[PDB]
Amino acid sequence: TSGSCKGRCFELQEVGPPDCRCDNLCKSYSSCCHDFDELCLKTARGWECTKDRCGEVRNEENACHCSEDCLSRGDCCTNYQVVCKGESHWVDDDCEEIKVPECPAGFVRPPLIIFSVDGFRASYMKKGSKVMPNIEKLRSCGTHAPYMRPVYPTKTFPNLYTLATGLYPESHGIVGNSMYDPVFDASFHLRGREKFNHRWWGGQPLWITATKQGVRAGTFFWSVSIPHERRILTILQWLSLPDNERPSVYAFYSEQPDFSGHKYGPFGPEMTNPLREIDKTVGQLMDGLKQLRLHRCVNVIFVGDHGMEDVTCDRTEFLSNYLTNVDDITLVPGTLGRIRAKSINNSKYDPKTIIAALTCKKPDQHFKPYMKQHLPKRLHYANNRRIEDIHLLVDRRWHVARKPLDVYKKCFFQGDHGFDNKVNSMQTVFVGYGPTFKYRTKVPPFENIELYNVMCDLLGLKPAPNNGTHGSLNHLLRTNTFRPTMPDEVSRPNYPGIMYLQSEFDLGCTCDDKNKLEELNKRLHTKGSTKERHLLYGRPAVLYRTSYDILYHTDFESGYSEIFLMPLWTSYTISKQAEVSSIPEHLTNCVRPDVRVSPGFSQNCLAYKNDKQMSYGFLFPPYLSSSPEAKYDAFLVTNMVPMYPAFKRVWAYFQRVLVKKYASERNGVNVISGPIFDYNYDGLRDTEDEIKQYVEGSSIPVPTHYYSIITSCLDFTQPADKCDGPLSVSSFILPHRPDNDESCNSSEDESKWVEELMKMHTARVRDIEHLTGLDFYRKTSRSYSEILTLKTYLHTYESE
Ligand SMILES: *[C@@H]1O[C@H](CO)[C@@H](O[C@@H]2O[C@H](CO)[C@@H](O[C@@H]3O[C@H](CO[C@H]4O[C@H](CO)[C@@H](O)[C@H](O[C@H]5O[C@H](CO)[C@@H](O)[C@H](O)[C@@H]5O[C@H]5O[C@H](CO)[C@@H](O)[C@H](O)[C@@H]5O)[C@@H]4O)[C@@H](O)[C@H](O[C@H]4O[C@H](CO)[C@@H](O)[C@H](O)[C@@H]4O[C@H]4O[C@H](CO)[C@@H](O)[C@H](O)[C@@H]4O)[C@@H]3O)[C@H](O)[C@H]2NC(C)=O)[C@H](O)[C@H]1NC(C)=O
Ligand SMILES: O=C(CCc1c[nH]c(=O)o1)N1C[C@H]2CCN(C(=O)c3cc(OCC4CCOCC4)nc(C4CC4)c3)CC[C@H]2C1
Ligand SMILES: [Ca+2]
Ligand SMILES: [Cl-]
Ligand SMILES: [K+]
Ligand code: NA
Ligand code: NA
Ligand SMILES: [Zn+2]
């Protein structure tokens, strides 16, 4: 702190102790030079010019200047030209399409300014629009989504760092605002020094991606005591540096409206002022850009990290009300819960019994416990040693705490966030404005994991490997689009014919089964004659090395795995007209050998008989067969999959009731169903040596999940099989569980709980692609980028 900040204010390259720092983060480290405050955080005379301040003689003690040299120097007050040159405020100008970057000579690319606002709930765009005129102009003149989905948990650090890396928290490492890493034996907290250590922070964030590729970055982080006006002026000043020193990417962060929303609730009357203040800050940025003639050159992103919900202390569930042993557990509390043993020397500690004591115990229980691998796959919240094996998903509006003492010894607060990222109130904002963004364009909602890629595109950078689907946000952009090619199929299928006699099959299976017109008929169905009906978008590509067969049938086509002894995928189309029939009595326990598939690559009924826990189901539902004759195909051993009796309740209702219901509402649907194996809960397809469970005494592996992809025409006046334009999709990844403990109402009728469980396990097609190594929608007439957008769509089942 002995050295000086003279001419070093907000140095871009930080310096090494014990030499004092003048970087915008030095306050946060107590390493600022003695004179930092006087030299770098000047405030003299305020933030604005007045009439009398114009053409003044430069006074270095001022906050910002109104002299005439200031423009070259880059440090005029942001309203200088308005008060001293008759100019108008950016907000008061009509918008004009920005067809090309209109940049000063010397700029090699449009700079990018990322303006992030903590806790900026998506509905503030509509509800606060009267008091945010600069933000409303960006929104209605630029590209905007009605909202942007955060990642889970909907906390500040996990979301800011996803924005920076394009990674799910489980991959980047910042899986909460608070963490314990058992390998380091260290804790990460909001307050304190451990969070600065580099070993917490995985992946490659944008500022490191920029630097490694020759693009210079302004520093993204700001000490909370540097006032917002000083942050804006600093960025404007950096933008005035000579070509060889001037950064190309900048970030401003605002602590508002999050700070106030915690105290007052998302819509407390006190919330108007922070919203005005954010707007005025945007105003200043745009005014300042306009003076430097940079307001049609720079791309501006206005983005939130998460929204904000109404939460008060009277809405707290206490674990002490459920557990006798509360003192043998550590709880990461609040809008999510993570539980571990207080002491790893405690050999009596048992997650199963803790879960059981936490499961459906009160009529209106406001949290639900999970082993982390049983959490909905759409949250991608398991594959990190910093995520405790026991997780509590907390109802929106609620807290979970260990004991009452914690709450009144640590009603103050009215707002909080952290809940499931599908929750409406957690949704945040996205606006893009600039030469590279589209003009007056609304785009559909998307996930924040997608932005890193887009920010790399806006700067001409190659993104590090990440969880975005690169190309899925091309429709936000006027140019710099990224044009990916479909992945190459790695394995080609066999097309087996009839090669085996009934009597070669010793499977312990039985079935009650027993004309030249109709015989040529049947053979063609087996040759793939109706495949254009049931495979509407082409067969999926297998993206890994395996042996598999395509099997055709009247009512469905499948890609049958010789390794896993079941289909990887089964595909079928159900028209609006289609009729549900029931399984005939003579066929209730019917399983038939498939004369195209070797007994050695087939399942067997004995294994299921022997396995007291495991039963079986069918991927193509016998209920939906087009004729009594076609129904025999649905009972083929190659259409069969292992299912727990508890899960059969779910599956049967989906197949007997819901598929037809969706076909009614959507004017026909195409369905692709199959098994998922994710025993190590990494969100990726298991190889065969990773499978932890098999049907008793056989090589039949047991899936962890079952998926379905349900596709139809976006224009529902066209039938699914005759669709001329964009598609509509919803999908699910259902956990394959031996009980229905997840659904508190499961002893009632399937119609009261099944559809709710499915909504909870809604999925993107892209989630199913990672989990299966398949690539879907290979043959459509749609552009590939549009297909990528479709694959990343998540049907949320939240109201308007
Ligand atoms: C979302 O996108 C991300 C980014 O693409 C995807 O994550 C990738 O998944 C890959 C496949 O699982 C994974 O590949 C592995 O790389 C290993 C090398 O890892 C280091 O180097 C990379 C590159 O710089 C670095 O990114 C890694 O950083 C991780 O770990 C550090 C330090 O621990 C953390 O700071 C950081 O946050 C990150 O942690 C995350 O990833 C790891 C897995 O790497 C998780 O376990 C953590 O929980 C956390 O999520 C690393 O520093 C390499 O060792 C692996 O190779 C093994 O398997 C292959 C098979 O090809 C084999 O050839 C090798 O020999 C090796 O096997 C040997 O080791 C095995 C394990 O020790 C052992 O069992 C065997 O017996 C063998 O001896 C593997 O290729 C890649 O690292 C991550 N990247 C990131 C950033 O997470 C992610 O999958 C996407 N998610 C979805 C759902 O799509
Ligand atoms: O005070 C708080 C949070 C308190 C709080 C309330 N609710 C909650 O969850 O946390 N903080 C005090 C600190 C305030 C200053 N911060 C940063 O400079 C910053 C910005 C930032 O941008 C990343 C860009 C990436 C590109 O796209 C736009 C965002 N990435 C970080 C971390 C992740 C590297 C920190 C905010 C975080 C701190 C957190
Ligand atoms: Ca896996
Ligand atoms: Cl947390
Ligand atoms: K059985
Ligand atoms: Na480039
Ligand atoms: Na139940
Ligand atoms: Zn907050």
Swiss-Prot record:
Its cofactor is Zn(2+); Ca(2+). 1-tetradecanoyl-sn-glycerol 3-phosphate binds at residues 156, 177, 258, 417. It catalyses: a 1-O-alkyl-sn-glycero-3-phosphoethanolamine + H2O = a 1-O-alkyl-sn-glycero-3-phosphate + ethanolamine + H(+); a 1-acyl-sn-glycero-3-phosphoethanolamine + H2O = a 1-acyl-sn-glycero-3-phosphate + ethanolamine + H(+); 1-(9Z-octadecenoyl)-sn-glycero-3-phosphoethanolamine + H2O = 1-(9Z-octadecenoyl)-sn-glycero-3-phosphate + ethanolamine + H(+); a 1-O-alkyl-sn-glycero-3-phosphocholine + H2O = a 1-O-alkyl-sn-glycero-3-phosphate + choline + H(+). It is found in: Secreted. Its main location: secreted. GO terms for molecular function: alkylglycerophosphoethanolamine phosphodiesterase activity; calcium ion binding; lysophospholipase activity; nucleic acid binding; phosphodiesterase I activity; phospholipase D activity; polysaccharide binding; scavenger receptor activity. Residues 1-44, 45-89 form the SMB domain. 1-hexadecanoyl-sn-glycero-3-phosphate binds at residues 156, 177, 258, 417. Belongs to the nucleotide pyrophosphatase/phosphodiesterase family. This is Autotaxin. It comes from Rattus norvegicus.
